[PDB]
Design an enzyme around this catalytic site. Structure first.
Site, PDB file in Angstrom:
ATOM      1  N   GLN A  98       8.488   3.565   6.413  1.00 15.35           N
ATOM      2  CA  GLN A  98       7.931   2.331   6.937  1.00 15.35           C
ATOM      3  C   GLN A  98       9.120   1.422   7.220  1.00 15.35           C
ATOM      4  OE1 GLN A  98       6.000  -0.896   4.662  1.00 15.35           O
ATOM      5  NE2 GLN A  98       4.190  -0.544   5.946  1.00 15.35           N
ATOM      6  N   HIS A 179       6.033  -1.691  10.449  1.00 16.14           N
ATOM      7  CA  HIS A 179       5.331  -2.649   9.600  1.00 16.14           C
ATOM      8  C   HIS A 179       4.948  -3.892  10.398  1.00 16.14           C
ATOM      9  CE1 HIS A 179       3.770  -4.734   6.327  1.00 16.14           C
ATOM     10  NE2 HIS A 179       4.666  -4.454   5.397  1.00 16.14           N
ATOM     11  N   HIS A 182       0.954  -7.766   6.919  1.00 20.11           N
ATOM     12  CA  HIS A 182       1.259  -8.585   5.757  1.00 20.11           C
ATOM     13  C   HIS A 182       2.189  -9.787   5.902  1.00 20.11           C
ATOM     14  CE1 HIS A 182       0.084  -4.621   3.507  1.00 20.11           C
ATOM     15  NE2 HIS A 182      -0.941  -5.196   4.111  1.00 20.11           N
ATOM     16  N   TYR A 184       4.914 -10.256   7.780  1.00 26.71           N
ATOM     17  CA  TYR A 184       6.340 -10.066   8.003  1.00 26.71           C
ATOM     18  C   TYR A 184       6.672 -10.393   9.459  1.00 26.71           C
ATOM     19  CZ  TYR A 184       6.262  -8.603   3.255  1.00 26.71           C
ATOM     20  OH  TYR A 184       6.055  -8.633   1.891  1.00 26.71           O
ATOM     21  N   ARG A 231       1.357  -0.044  11.127  1.00 25.48           N
ATOM     22  CA  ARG A 231       0.435  -0.629  10.173  1.00 25.48           C
ATOM     23  C   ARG A 231       0.146  -2.068  10.563  1.00 25.48           C
ATOM     24  NH1 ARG A 231       0.241  -1.034   3.463  1.00 25.48           N
ATOM     25  NH2 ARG A 231      -1.725   0.141   3.443  1.00 25.48           N
ATOM     26  N   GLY A 321      -2.557   3.033  -2.778  1.00 25.62           N
ATOM     27  CA  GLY A 321      -1.324   2.409  -3.225  1.00 25.62           C
ATOM     28  C   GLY A 321      -1.102   2.484  -4.721  1.00 25.62           C
TER      29      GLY A 321
END
Ligand SMILES: Cc1cc2nc3c(=O)[nH]c(=O)nc-3n(C[C@H](O)[C@H](O)[C@H](O)COP(=O)(O)O)c2cc1C
Length: 362
Positions: A98, A179, A182, A184, A231, A321
């Protein structure tokens, strides 16, 4: 039961649909943000996963936001990752790396030159990241206010992702996962709450998704579309980054655009660890009809939920996870209906072997 049946994922074939979700553990070596032999053992123990998705890894030094997170931009890092992927492969496993750029979820003390981190706009994330103290222990620190990327700096960001993918290929990874979730960097551009730009990278959803799509095109060109996964966490609020007032519509737009590239997979992180509204089956259908590759569901999934959605043909695999942190042989346990090892959250971030490689297999 379908969780234990094969699945074609881009250029590789997973023997089961029980995937290991990307999990930041902050145990890399500093200086150098170098993967360690301990990390290699950790991944090797979990090689039975249908697919292992690695902890978030920096595409560049500027991408760093957490002390202990590994990178995939230096020679030393590439050399270390080669050993890790070889170990996974020695066990007949598959692993995707990732790749991320933390953007504003960072701190100046770990940025090149000790300067302020970058983002879509100059807005503090208003959260915390993890650094290390004088003894190497993980500590929480408030995020540094970011500098808004100059328009002429954008091509560089895309190039960093492109180069990181080239390195991933040499490092022996089977796939790469961008990624774009979330809160970022990529998500910072996608979200209206974190993006106040007035150039072509802000405003409309087309403008907000521009960066992530340029990255996708660049990496597909660099390697191959069937080696690329992404993702997203397009519904709800994550680390203070929400998805706008038209989150569902904007999500479907992005998914349709991604589909045009024929990438290997779409990985949807459904909720923040703190929770969120559950995806409706109607929305899952709209997502399914728009993407032609593998769809991975994630977020506090239960074996039952995975089987239910895979059976309904809404998703193809599930990424676990925390259960993977505590159960190296999660596949065998789920298959045999065996009990799971209890989780020890205090050792999720930082430290060493304890709470990392000491969770026993059956
Ligand atoms: C310790 C920890 C670290 C994580 N690091 C990452 C990360 O590197 N990349 C990411 O996309 N999500 C990350 N996640 C989110 C997980 O991939 C996953 O989506 C989440 O834990 C919910 O799934 P679960 O209920 O199966 O644990 C992290 C979660 C935990 C608990």
């Amino acid at each position: 039961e379908k969780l234990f049946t094969p699945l074609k994922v881009g250029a590789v074939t997973a023997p089961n649909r029980v995937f290991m979700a990307p999990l930041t553990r902050l145990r890399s070596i500093e200086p150098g943000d170098i993967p360690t032999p301990l990390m290699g053992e950790y991944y090797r123990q979990r090689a039975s996963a249908g697919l292992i998705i690695s902890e978030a890894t920096q595409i560049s030094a500027q991408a760093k936001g957490y002390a202990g997170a590994p990178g995939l931009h230096s020679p030393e890092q590439i050399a270390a990752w080669k050993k890790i992927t070889a170990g996974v492969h020695a066990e007949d496993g598959r692993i995707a790396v990732q790749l991320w750029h933390t953007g504003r979820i960072s701190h100046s003390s770990i940025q090149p030159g000790g300067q302020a981190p970058v983002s879509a706009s100059a807005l503090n994330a208003n959260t915390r990241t993890s650094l290390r103290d004088e003894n190497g222990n993980a500590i929480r620190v408030d995020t540094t206010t970011p500098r808004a990327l100059e328009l002429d700096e954008i091509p560089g960001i895309v190039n960093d992702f492109r180069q990181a993918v080239a390195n991933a290929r040499e490092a022996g990874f089977d796939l790469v996962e961008l990624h774009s979730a979330h809160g970022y960097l990529l998500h910072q551009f996608l979200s209206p709450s974190s993006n106040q730009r007035t150039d072509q990278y802000g405003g409309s959803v087309e403008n907000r998704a521009r960066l992530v799509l340029e990255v996708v095109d660049a990496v597909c060109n660099e390697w191959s579309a069937d080696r690329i996964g992404i993702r997203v966490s397009p519904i709800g609020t994550f680390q203070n980054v929400d998805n706008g007032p038209n989150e569902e519509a904007d999500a479907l737009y992005l998914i349709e655009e991604l589909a045009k590239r024929g990438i290997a997979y779409l990985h949807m992180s459904e909720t923040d660890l703190a929770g969120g509204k559950p995806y409706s089956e109607a929305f899952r259908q709209k997502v399914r009809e728009r993407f032609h590759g593998v769809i991975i569901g994630a977020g506090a999934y239960t074996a039952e939920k995975a089987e239910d959605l895979i059976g309904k043909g809404l998703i193809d695999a599930v990424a676990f996870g925390r259960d993977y942190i505590a159960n190296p042989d999660l596949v065998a346990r789920l298959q045999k209906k065996a009990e799971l090892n209890p989780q020890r959250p205090e050792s999720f971030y930082g430290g060493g072997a304890e709470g990392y490689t000491d969770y026993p297999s059956l």
